[PDB]
Design a protein around this nucleic acid. Structure first.
Lengths: 92, 47, 285, 119
RNA sequence: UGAGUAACGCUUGGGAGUGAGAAUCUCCCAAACCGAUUGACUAAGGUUUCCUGGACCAGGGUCGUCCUUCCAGGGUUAGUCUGGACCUAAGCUGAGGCUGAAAAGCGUAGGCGAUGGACAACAGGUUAAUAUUCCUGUACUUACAGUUAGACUGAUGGAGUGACAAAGAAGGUUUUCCACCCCCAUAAUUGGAUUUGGGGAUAAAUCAUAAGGUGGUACAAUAGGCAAAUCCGUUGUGCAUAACAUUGAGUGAUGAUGUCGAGUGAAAGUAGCGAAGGUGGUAUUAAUCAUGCUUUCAAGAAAAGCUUCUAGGGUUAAUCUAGCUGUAACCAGUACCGAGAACGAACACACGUAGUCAAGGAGAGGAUCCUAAGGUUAGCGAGUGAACUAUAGCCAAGGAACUCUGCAAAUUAACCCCGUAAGUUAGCGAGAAGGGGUGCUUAUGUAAAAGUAAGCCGCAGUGAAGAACGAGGGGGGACUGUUUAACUAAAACACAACUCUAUGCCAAACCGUAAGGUGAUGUAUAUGGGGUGACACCUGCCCAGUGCUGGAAGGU
RNA sequence: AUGAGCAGGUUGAAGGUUGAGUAACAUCAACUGGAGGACCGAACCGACUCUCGUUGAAACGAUAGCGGAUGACUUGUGAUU
C-alpha cells in the first residue's frame, strides 16, 4: 500500500443498480499496478477494515471523440468492486 | 477464396515483436534510418 | 523367406512380396522396452542449417533407434541367454534380446542360425566360434565367417553389419598387425588383429529378393519418388534439356554438378590407408 | 438472366390476391395498386358469387381462398361472412365494389387506390 | 462528353402507431424459405462494431423519421475454467568455447517454445450488455503456522510409471425407440364424430455397490543400474483353481423440505402460480469398460510429474500421515460477430476457410423433398407480357442426317428376382451383356417383417426428391497417383522394377571458405549418381574417332 | 514435431481351426477372419467439356455434371528451406 493506487470511487447506472441491492459491492477506480490481494489489503490499511471479496477488471482503452480531425484514446484504469458482510456499510 | 493476409496478433508478436526484433543489426540500422526519417510509428506497440 | 502378395484390388495388380513375420518372428504386436529406445530423427534430406543436401528422402513413420552395445566390450566374461529375436526397422538386420546373468539386459544384432533360448558368452578370451559371439581377432583360425569388425582399437563394430554380410581371413602381415581380410563387395584390406568382431554371417538373406511393389510403399520407406536427371531444363541439369525425348548426347556425362561420375573412382589415393589396401573389387591394390 | 428475384409469377400473384381479399373481408377497406386491384376485383366478385347459397359445400371450397390476420380468426371471418355479409349483395347484379385511385405512393411515385364495397 | 445512360450488387404483402412529412421507423398476422442451416457452443482474429436515449453532417445501390451511422452515458467480475506462477517436442536463444578479414556463423553448459502430460465447482437465478467470472443452494482443493493422534522419512542420484501407432469386430452399462399408464388442455355445429395433442427432468460432491477389465503372485539372496540399496532387474522355491496387485462403468442413499415443469397468470405473457414428474425391452444406433482385446506392419514422442530404493540424515526428532483451528489462493482473459451484414474480403464483393452439437417421416445413410426449435425478407421499387439475351417446360416424325466432331443435349441408375460371354497374369471381367416385376386392401404372417394367397384401382405404382447410358477394336501408358497459380491436366512427370557406376569410416558425395553437419544419430542385402521405366523374350555389331580407366617399357 | 477428421451401404482375402482324405503329401469341405495404393457413395480435395459471364457478384466464380472418396489419405498449430 503506497497510498497512491486508490484514486476515486465511481458512480454510474449499473453501479447504482448494484448498490440499491444488498450486494454491498462498493466500486472504485485505481491504478492497475496492484494485484487483487494487494488492492484488498490496501483498502484494509486505508480504512482499517478488511474487505470480504474483491473482483477486478480494467476499462479497455477505446477511441475517444469518435470520428473527427483529432481522434484520441480512452485512459486505462482498473475497476475494483468489493463485497462486504451485510451487517456493515462503509462511509465515503 | 482466401487472400494472402491472415491477421493473428500472437504470431505478429513473435514476428515483428521488438524482443524477437533484436535478432540482427540490420534491424537496428533500419529503425535508425526510420528515426532519422522521423517515422512516428516505429513498432507494433505504437500503432 | 518371402511370400507373394495377393493384390485383391480392381486397379491392376501388385508385384510385391512380404516377409513371413509369423514363423521367423514372434510377437508381431510391437511391445518393446523403454530405456534403450530413443527416437531416430529424420533430417528430411537436409543439413543442420536447413539447406538442401540430399535428394528423395522422407515419408517414413516414427522409428526408435535401439541403444546397442556396438563395442561389445562394455561387459565381458559374463554368461547370457538369448531371449528373443525382434525386428529392427531402423537397420537392415533385426535386433535381438539377450539377458546378462548379473541383472542387466542386452540388445545385439544377431546372425543366422540362432533361436530363442540359447546360451551366449561375451568375453575378451578365446570362446565359442559359433556365430553371434564377440571375441577378439587373435584366436580365430583363418577361412571362417565373421562380421561387424572395427578398425580402431575399441572402436565398435560398424563394417559388414548389414543383413547377409561377413568377412574372410587371408593371413596376417609381418608387423604383428595388419591381418589380411577379404572385405565385403569384393574388397580386401588389412585391419588390426586385436579388434572385436561378431563371428558368422548376418541373417535375413531376404533383402536381395525384396520388391517394394508400389510407389507408396517406397515413400513410406523414406525414399520419396524423385525426378530423373534428363527431365529438367538445360539450365538446371546437364542431362536435362532439349524436347522430344532426347537421350544423352555427350561422352561420359556429368552429375547435376560439374562432377563426371562414370568410369572414375571417387577417392583420394595419397592416404597411407590406400597403401594398406589389398584389392579393389577388381584385382590386387 | 441468372439468379434473381422470382418476380411476377402466377403463384405469387394468386397468393397475393388471396391475402388481399382476406384482408378486405377482414377490415373492409384496403389500399393497393390498380395493376393488382383490377384482377382482385374479378377474383373477389367471383368469390362473392360462388358462396351466396351458404351451404356446407360452399364453406368447403371457400376455405381455399382465405388467409389470417392479427385481429380475427379465419373461422370467425367465414362465420360472419356467411351469416350476414355474403348474402348482402344478392339484390343488384354485380358492381359490389369500387376502386378509387388515390395519390401515388411516396416511395417510387407508384399509384395507390382504396377499395370500398356496397350494393 | 458520352447520359439522365447499364445496373440498381442471390427474396413479400397488410393493418395500426410514431413522426409535419412513410413500401423504407416501430408492434403484430400470414406466405415461401435455411433448417448436417437463415441453429447453437465455438479456437483464433477486427476490437467497442456491444447496450440505452437524442439526431441523421458525411457512408448506406431511390430514400432512410433509420442503420451495427454520429453525439452523451453505460458495458466485460474467476482458489476451482482458458493461457502464467509445474514442465517441455519440433524448433529457437545461448555463459563460455570453436570457426571465421572484421562482420558473422557454429554450438556447450544453460534458458525459452502447446496443437500436450499432471492438474482443485456444478446447477439454478436476474439484467440494457456478460456472467465454469455477480447471488443462493450444494462441494471440493492446495501450502501456511500451532495443535494433539501415528510413525524414521527418505534424494539431489537410480529405477518403475507417465509413455502414447493404425485398423477391425463384439460385449456390459445406462440410452434411443415403441406400446401401456399417469397428468395436463380438451366434445368441436360445414357432411360423419362415439376428442386429439403434449408432458412425464433433476446434477456437482460424499458414502457403499462397483457389471466388468488388465497383468504373475508370495518367499531367499546375487558379480548390473559413479556411491549404496529392501527399489528395478537375474536365478532359484510355493500356487497357477486365481489367489494376488489393480481400475472400472453404472447402480442405491443422500443430494432432493429443493429447483424445475408445459402451461396458468395483475400495466409484463411478467411477479406470482404450476399436475404428473414411471413402468419391460431392444434383432437400430454414441460413450463410459476402452492406453480393453485381437489383427496388419510402416514397429508407433520427451520433459514435468506420482510411487519410489539407498544416499542423505533424524532423535528428546529430521521428515511425514490423520483430525481440528486460523490464514489465503496472486497473472492476462471473458461483450457480440463469431465457415461470418464484424476473418480474408480493395466493399452492406451472391465466395470460402479450426473443432463440437447435428431432428423427424419416407431411405441404410448425415444421399434428396418437406417442415421441428431458432431465424428470415438478403437497404431501388411499380408495371405491362414487343423484338432479342439467360435459364427452363413442351415438343410429334425422320433420330446424329449437324459438324472434324454424340462438343452440347434425352431412357437408363432405387428395390428385390433371375442371369451374365470371351480373355485372363484366375485379380477381375460383372452391377457385364440381357431381362421380370415393385400400389393398396383382406388373410396369413416371423423376433419386427420380408414373403405368399384372395380381391381392387389407374394409362401406367425410386406415384413428386435423389440416384449409371453399353458392347465390340486400336495407339500409348500397366494400374492407384503429381501436375503448369487463373489459357491448356496428360501417352508429360512419377512409378515398382531392370540396369551401370561410385562409395570400407575422419566412407563417397554433398552445404560454406570454415569449424561442423547432412550423408547418418547409415555401414555395401546401405546410399548416391547415369540410363529405361506393368509382364514376358531379348537389347545384335564396331571402342573407327572421341570419352573413362589401367598400365608399363619408352620420345615430349 | 504435435494433431483433427475422412457418414452410410458394403464386398468378404490370406492366415489360421477342424474334418474327410493321402504313407506323407496333395486335394476338397465347414468355420473365425476384415485385409484390399477394393466398390457405390457422402462432408471433403481439386476442377475435365460446354454454358452465364469476362468495366462479371469474380485481379477466376457458379451451374449440368465431374476423378478421388482407407490411402502415393485432406488438413491444422509452430518452425525450417
Amino acid at each position: 500500500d503506497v497510498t497512491n493506487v486508490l484514486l476515486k470511487p465511481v458512480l454510474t447506472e449499473k453501479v447504482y443498480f448494484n448498490q440499491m441491492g444488498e450486494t454491498k459491492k462498493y466500486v472504485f477506480v485505481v491504478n492497475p499496478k496492484a494485484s487483487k490481494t494487494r488492492v484488498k489489503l490496501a483498502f484494509e490499511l486505508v480504512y482499517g477494515i478488511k474487505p470480504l471479496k474483491v473482483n477486478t477488471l480494467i476499462r479497455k482503452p477505446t477511441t475517444i471523440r469518435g470520428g473527427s480531425r483529432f481522434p484520441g484514446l480512452s485512459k486505462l484504469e482498473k475497476l475494483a468492486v468489493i463485497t462486504l458482510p451485510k451487517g456493515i456499510a462503509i462511509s465515503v | 477464396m482466401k487472400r494472402t493476409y491472415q491477421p493473428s496478433k500472437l504470431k505478429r508478436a513473435k514476428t515483428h515483436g521488438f524482443l524477437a526484433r533484436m535478432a540482427t543489426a540490420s534491424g537496428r540500422k533500419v529503425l535508425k534510418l526510420r528515426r532519422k526519417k522521423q517515422r512516428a510509428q516505429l513498432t507494433v506497440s505504437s500503432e | 523367406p518371402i511370400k507373394k502378395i495377393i493384390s485383391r484390388s480392381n486397379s491392376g495388380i501388385h508385384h510385391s512380396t512380404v516377409i513371413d513375420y509369423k514363423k521367423l518372428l514372434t510377437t508381431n504386436k510391437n511391445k518393446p522396452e523403454k530405456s534403450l529406445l530413443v527416437t531416430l530423427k529424420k533430417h528430411g534430406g537436409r543439413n543442420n542449417q536447413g539447406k538442401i543436401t540430399v535428394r528423395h528422402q522422407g515419408g517414413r513413420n516414427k522409428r526408435k533407434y535401439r541403444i546397442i552395445d556396438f563395442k561389445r566390450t562394455h561387459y565381458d566374461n559374463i554368461e547370457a541367454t538369448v531371449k528373443s529375436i525382434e525386428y529392427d526397422p531402423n537397420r537392415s538386420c533385426f535386433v535381438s534380446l539377450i539377458t546378462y546373468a548379473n541383472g542387466a539386459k542386452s540388445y545385439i544384432i544377431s546372425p543366422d542360425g540362432i533361436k530363442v533360448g540359447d546360451k551366449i558368452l561375451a568375453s575378451e578370451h578365446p570362446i565359442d566360434i559359433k556365430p553371434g559371439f564377440s571375441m577378439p581377432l587373435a584366436f580365430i583360425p583363418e577361412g571362417t565367417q565373421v562380421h561387424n569388425i572395427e578398425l580402431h582399437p575399441k572402436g565398435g563394430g560398424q563394417i559388414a553389419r548389414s543383413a547377409g554380410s561377413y568377412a574372410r581371413i587371408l593371413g596376417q602381415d609381418e608387423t604383428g598387425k595388419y591381418v589380411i581380410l577379404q572385405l565385403l563387395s569384393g574388397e580386401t584390406r588389412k585391419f588390426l588383429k586385436e579388434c572385436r568382431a561378431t563371428v558368422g554371417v548376418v541373417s535375413n538373406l531376404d533383402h536381395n529378393l525384396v520388391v517394394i511393389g508400389k510407389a507408396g510403399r517406397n515413400r513410406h520407406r523414406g525414399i520419396r519418388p524423385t525426378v530423373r536427371g534428363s527431365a529438367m531444363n538445360p539450365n538446371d541439369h546437364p542431362h536435362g534439356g532439349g524436347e522430344g525425348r532426347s537421350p544423352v548426347g555427350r561422352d561420359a556425362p556429368r552429375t547435376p554438378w560439374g562432377k563426371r561420375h562414370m568410369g572414375v573412382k571417387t577417392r583420394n589415393m595419397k592416404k597411407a590407408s590406400t597403401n594398406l589396401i589389398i584389392r579393389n573389387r577388381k584385382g590386387e591394390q | 438472366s441468372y439468379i434473381n428475384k422470382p418476380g411476377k409469377t402466377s403463384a405469387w400473384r394468386v397468393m397475393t390476391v388471396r391475402q388481399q381479399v382476406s384482408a378486405v373481408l377482414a377490415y373492409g377497406k384496403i389500399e393497393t395498386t390498380l395493376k393488382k386491384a383490377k384482377n382482385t376485383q374479378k377474383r373477389l366478385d367471383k368469390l362473392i358469387t360462388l358462396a351466396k347459397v351458404d351451404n356446407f359445400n360452399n364453406r368447403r371450397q371457400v376455405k381455399k381462398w382465405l388467409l389470417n390476420t392479427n385481429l380475427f380468426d379465419v373461422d370467425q371471418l367465414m362465420d360472419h361472412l356467411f351469416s350476414k355479409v355474403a348474402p348482402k349483395y344478392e339484390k343488384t347484379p354485380g358492381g359490389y365494389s369500387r376502386v378509387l385511385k388515390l395519390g401515388p405512393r411516396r416511395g417510387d411515385a407508384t399509384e395507390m387506390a382504396i377499395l370500398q364495397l356496397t350494393d
